[PDB]
Scaffold this active site. Structure first.
Site, PDB file in Angstrom:
ATOM      1  CG  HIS A 132      -2.139  -1.266   1.305  1.00 46.57           C
ATOM      2  ND1 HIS A 132      -3.094  -1.473  -0.063  1.00 46.57           N
ATOM      3  CD2 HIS A 132      -1.968  -2.050   1.597  1.00 46.57           C
ATOM      4  CE1 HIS A 132      -3.987  -2.378   0.274  1.00 46.57           C
ATOM      5  NE2 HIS A 132      -3.237  -2.953   1.621  1.00 46.57           N
ATOM      6  CE  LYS A 181      -5.240  -6.974  -2.191  1.00 46.87           C
ATOM      7  NZ  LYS A 181      -4.425  -6.429  -1.456  1.00 46.87           N
ATOM      8  N   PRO A 182      -7.340  -8.626  -7.191  1.00 47.77           N
ATOM      9  CG  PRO A 182      -8.547 -10.030  -7.549  1.00 47.77           C
ATOM     10  CD  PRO A 182      -7.556  -9.844  -6.184  1.00 47.77           C
ATOM     11  CB  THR A 201      -5.676   1.040  -2.093  1.00 46.42           C
ATOM     12  OG1 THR A 201      -6.823   0.681  -3.165  1.00 46.42           O
ATOM     13  CG2 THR A 201      -5.976   3.501  -2.810  1.00 46.42           C
ATOM     14  NE  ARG A 207     -12.216  -1.222  -7.309  1.00 44.55           N
ATOM     15  CZ  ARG A 207     -13.252  -1.767  -6.536  1.00 44.55           C
ATOM     16  NH1 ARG A 207     -13.391  -3.110  -6.547  1.00 44.55           N
ATOM     17  NH2 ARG A 207     -13.001  -2.031  -5.519  1.00 44.55           N
ATOM     18  CG  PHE A 253      -5.902   0.533   2.072  1.00 43.02           C
ATOM     19  CD1 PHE A 253      -7.576   0.591   1.366  1.00 43.02           C
ATOM     20  CD2 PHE A 253      -5.205   1.803   2.248  1.00 43.02           C
ATOM     21  CE1 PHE A 253      -7.285   1.873   0.372  1.00 43.02           C
ATOM     22  CE2 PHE A 253      -5.651   3.608   1.657  1.00 43.02           C
ATOM     23  CZ  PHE A 253      -7.030   2.903   1.163  1.00 43.02           C
ATOM     24  CG  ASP A 254     -11.646  -1.789   5.678  1.00 45.46           C
ATOM     25  OD1 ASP A 254     -12.238  -2.643   6.058  1.00 45.46           O
ATOM     26  OD2 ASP A 254     -13.246  -1.185   6.295  1.00 45.46           O
TER      27      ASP A 254
END
Lengths: 124, 124
Positions: free
Chosen positions: A12, A41-42, A45, A85, A120-121
Site C-alpha cells: 500500500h 490480486k483483484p 490501493t 483494479r 487498507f479498508d
C-alpha cells in the site's frame, strides 16, 4: 513469513511519487510489489504520502471497519492515492489493471505495538 | 424476502438530495433505511444521483470486485456520495455514525435481467 506491518507497506505504500505517473502505473506496481505472483490480486490501493503520514492515521479518527471490527482509522485529511483494479483483459499470469488516481481520506486497520497500519479498508 | 435489486435501492440510493445536508445525515438515514434494526450496519454508502444514472453504471467500465468476482462496474463519471461509518460512541441499539460527503466514482456489482446493481463494492 512477512509481518502484518511490512505486508501493508509492500502492498500500500508508494512515497516515491506524488501520484500515478501513467495509465500503466498499476500494471507496473502490482507486478513489482509481488501482487501478481501466484494470482492477480483483484483490487489494491497505493498511497502517495510519506510512511510517517500514513502511520499517523492510526491516531486519527477511530471508525468501524467494513467487517465490524473497531480498530480502523480514517485520515483527517485527504491523501493522494491510486486504486488498481483488474480489467476484463486480465488473466493470470498476464494480469492487467486499470489505474485510477484520486485524493481521498484513507481508512486503515491498525494493530500492534507500535500501533501501525495492517490493512487498507477503504478510501472516502 | 427483499429482492437483491430492491435491497440495493434501500441501502444505497438517495436521489432526493444533492449531498448530505448535515453531520447528522447518516444517523437519520441509517435508521430510516432500516440499517439499524437488529444491529448497527458498520459501513454504508449512499449515492446522491438518479436511480437511472446509478443503474447505468452496469453498462460502464467492467472491473473486478474486491472479492475477485467479475461482475463489477466502475462509473465513468464521479458521483455525489455519502459514506456512513459507525463511530466509537456507537452501541446497538443507539447506533452512531460519521457522515463523510465526497464526489467519487462508484463501483457496483450487477446481476439479473434487467442487469442492475445488487452490491455497493467501493468508491474511488
Amino acid at each position: 513469513k512477512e509481518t502484518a506491518a511490512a505486508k501493508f507497506e509492500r502492498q500500500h505504500m508508494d512515497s516515491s511519487t506524488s501520484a500515478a505517473s501513467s495509465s500503466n502505473y498499476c500494471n507496473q506496481m502490482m507486478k513489482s510489489r509481488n501482487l501478481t505472483k501466484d494470482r492477480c490480486k483483484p483490487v489494491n490501493t497505493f498511497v502517495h504520502e510519506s510512511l510517517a503520514d500514513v502511520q499517523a492515521v492510526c491516531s486519527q479518527k477511530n471508525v468501524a471497519c467494513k467487517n465490524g471490527q473497531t480498530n480502523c482509522y480514517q485520515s483527517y485529511s485527504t491523501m493522494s492515492i491510486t486504486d488498481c483494479r483488474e480489467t476484463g483483459s486480465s488473466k493470470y499470469p498476464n494480469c492487467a489493471y486499470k489505474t485510477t488516481q484520486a485524493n481521498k481520506h484513507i481508512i486503515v486497520a491498525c494493530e500492534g505495538n507500535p500501533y501501525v497500519p495492517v490493512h487498507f479498508d477503504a478510501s472516502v
